[PDB]
């Protein structure tokens, strides 16, 4: 009873899109956080064996100079979307003499959110966390493999998206400082990792208007670790 | 149209190629050829599944098909299915002479044809080639070379081959015959005669059902000697006296 996977089943909706959501179960998770001072994001590389090199796999990439991003599920699936999105923001700075800020990147990816099809190809199951600083200050946006862009200030992906966000939605009250959310994320991080926290396990994504870029630095990644 | 597609190109759940495993079952049947190392020359022999004597045999070389004046290839498989690859590689060998003016080496000649058979296996769902043919020739670098093609798109090239069904008793004997090269071109052909006489189904080493073509390295013509079946019978009876001489020991 599998018809074309694109054919709007008896329920009904796309098969492969419904399947690609389960493709997040086979890969690691992240935790987004947004604050008026800055946007901080955390992830876990899910190291299976010590043979894995930490800088080889990175779950946070910066699409535009002031615009960061986070991938989900597989790697090379986002890599086609990641690298091509860097061409987008650059041509926008060529025509308008200004880079895309936090918004025109979304609609650029939202237009291509689902390009897939059989005739006239396969949709990726990678969720994307769009960070950056626009004219409105630091902002963090989220999108799903289904293609519908909904604004999520602080969003978590992965198989932990259920549990990690449940306690995260309660702590996002505007009376919390950025420094309080930084140590609030590592509390959920040490619970979702089976291996003891080490320099190679996790990385951090922090972008601010004043401090940049940044991106992120080296040896400052290990300071938040020993504080666990 | 997803149910009508039989997933030829796509693999089998067992890890094997589903279309290729059923393809090579035809290679184990049908065509029968052989190869061996020989000094200052190379020999090729094949037995026809058309060997029924009602044919005219006006084709001269049939299973022996000669792609170029300096190169021949012994084919095992469907004739016209191979004839698409013959003129193709013949043009690939000819387009090489065009931009170069120098004989095409055997190494890249096999890798060029194996990719043509591979292209239909990797995409398009097209019927892959069930033809496995040999290769002979000479170059100024590695000299004498032997090669084999596989339906999966791989070159089966070695210095020896077993194709495709019979020759069994001679196969293990070839490993005892593994002593590398000799000539006396008639001596290496004598070893090929005990292969055809002993391991044939009706035996008797029928002369009209088999054909032997030998390439002799010559500067710079590289003369290919195609036996007229008049000197095959004396070559057949040459080693039959040696085979009768070999049984004088015990």
């Amino acid at each position: 009873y599998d018809r074309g996977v694109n054919t709007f089943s008896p329920e009904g909706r796309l098969f492969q899109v419904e399947y690609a959501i389960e493709a997040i179960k086979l890969g690691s998770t992240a935790i987004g956080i947004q604050t008026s001072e800055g946007v901080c994001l955390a992830v876990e590389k899910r190291i299976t064996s010590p043979l894995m090199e930490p800088s080889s796999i990175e779950k946070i990439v910066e699409i535009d100079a002031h615009i960061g991003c986070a991938m989900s599920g597989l790697i090379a699936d986002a890599k086609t979307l990641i690298d091509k999105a860097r061409v987008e923001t650059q041509n926008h700075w060529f025509t308008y003499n200004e880079t895309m800020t936090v918004e025109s990147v979304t609609q650029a990816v939202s237009n291509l959110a689902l390009q897939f099809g059989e005739e006239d190809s396969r949709p990726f199951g990678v969720a994307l966390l769009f960070g950056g600083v626009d004219e409105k200050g630091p902002q963090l946006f989220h999108m799903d493999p289904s293609g519908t862009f909904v604004q999520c200030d602080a969003r978590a992906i992965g198989s932990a998206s259920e549990g990690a966000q449940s306690s995260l939605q309660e702590v996002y009250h505007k009376s919390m400082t950025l420094k309080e959310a930084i140590k609030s994320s590592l509390i959920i991080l040490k619970q979702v990792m089976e291996e003891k926290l080490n320099a190679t396990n996790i990385e951090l994504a922090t972008v601010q208007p004043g401090q940049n870029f940044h991106m992120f630095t080296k040896e400052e990644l290990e300071e938040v670790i020993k504080d666990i | 149209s997803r149910r009508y597609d039989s997933r030829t190109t796509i693999f089998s759940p067992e890890g094997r190629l589903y279309q290729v495993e059923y393809a090579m079952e035809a290679i184990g049947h049908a065509g029968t050829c052989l190869g061996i190392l020989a000094n200052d020359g190379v020999l090729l022999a094949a037995e026809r599944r058309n060997i029924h004597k009602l044919l005219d045999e006006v084709f001269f070389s049939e299973k022996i098909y000669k792609l170029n004046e300096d190169m021949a290839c012994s084919v095992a498989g469907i004739t016209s299915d191979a004839n698409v690859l013959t003129n193709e590689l013949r043009l690939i060998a000819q387009r090489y002479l065009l931009q170069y003016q120098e004989p095409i080496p055997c190494e890249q000649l096999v890798t060029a044809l194996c990719d043509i058979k591979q292209a239909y296996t990797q995409f398009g769902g097209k019927r892959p080639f069930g033809v496995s043919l040999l290769y002979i020739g000479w170059d100024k670098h590695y000299g004498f070379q032997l090669y084999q093609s596989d339906p999966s798109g791989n070159y089966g090239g070695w210095k020896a081959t077993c194709i495709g069904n019979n020759s069994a008793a001679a196969v293990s004997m070839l490993k005892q015959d593994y002593k590398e090269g000799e000539m006396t071109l008639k001596s290496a052909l004598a070893l090929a005669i005990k292969v055809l006489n002993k391991t044939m189904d009706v035996s008797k080493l029928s002369a009209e059902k088999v054909e032997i073509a030998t390439l002799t390295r010559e500067n710079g013509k590289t003369v290919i000697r195609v036996l007229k079946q008049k000197e095959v019978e004396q070559l057949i009876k040459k080693h039959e006296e040696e085979e009768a001489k070999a049984e004088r020991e015990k």
Binding site: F94, T95, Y96, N97, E98, E103, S104, Q107 | -
Partner: protein
């Protein structure tokens, strides 16, 4: 054979003050001795803070202007905001260059409020090379403008003269005298004069009458 490019006349002078800008262009559209129409304002307002003039071939003037207005809604419906003053001249640079083989023949001068709330003038050429300038004069009457404008607004061709940037008023009649003097030897300029003043409160326009011969 058929000439796709021809010069329809007109002169554009836009002087940008400190916190605002002014755009001036004649409304006479004429080819040769005959006059198409006496009132044909060349000043086109894309937004409230930006007003662009058009000169030269008249067919490419309305075309290039309406294409930008079509590209305004493309950016306005994308980022939910209007194009910045620097983006309009930058996007036009990519538009004029893409046609480089068969380019429009147009003389455009953009002026108005930038993102800093100040006046800026962008000099344009058919190859699409622009820069931010204080004041520029286009059209065929610029031969008597830039030497006189630099003598007055630019404070050149003089000695011991302090630099005081102008704002409004007198720059008006500076466009009047150069056209009456040009109307003598050149019939491509005259009739009605449409001058636009771009300010933070809106756009103000005024009509100036000139000799008809």
């Amino acid at each position: 054979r058929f000439s796709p490019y021809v010069f329809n006349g007109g002169t554009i002078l836009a002087i940008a003050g400190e916190d605002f800008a002014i755009v001036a262009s004649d409304t006479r559209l004429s080819e040769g001795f005959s006059i198409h129409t006496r009132d044909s304002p060349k000043c086109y307002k894309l937004t409230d803070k930006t007003v662009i003039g058009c000169s030269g071939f008249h067919g490419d003037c309305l075309t290039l202007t309406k294409i930008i207005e079509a590209r305004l809604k493309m950016y306005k419906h994308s980022n939910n905001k209007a194009m910045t003053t620097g983006a309009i001249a930058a996007m036009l640079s990519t538009i004029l260059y893409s046609r480089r083989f068969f380019p429009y023949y147009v003389y455009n001068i953009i002026g108005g409020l930038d993102e800093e709330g100040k006046g800026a003038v962008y000099s344009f050429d058919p190859v699409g090379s622009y820069q931010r300038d204080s004041f520029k004069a286009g059209g065929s009457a610029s031969a008597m403008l830039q030497p006189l404008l630099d003598n007055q607004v630019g404070f050149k061709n003089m000695q011991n003269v302090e630099h005081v940037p102008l704002s409004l008023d007198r720059a008006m009649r500076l466009v009047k005298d150069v056209f009456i003097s040009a109307a003598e030897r050149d019939v491509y300029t005259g009739d009605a004069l449409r001058i636009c003043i771009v300010t933070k409160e809106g756009i103000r326009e005024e009509t100036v009458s000139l000799r008809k011969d």
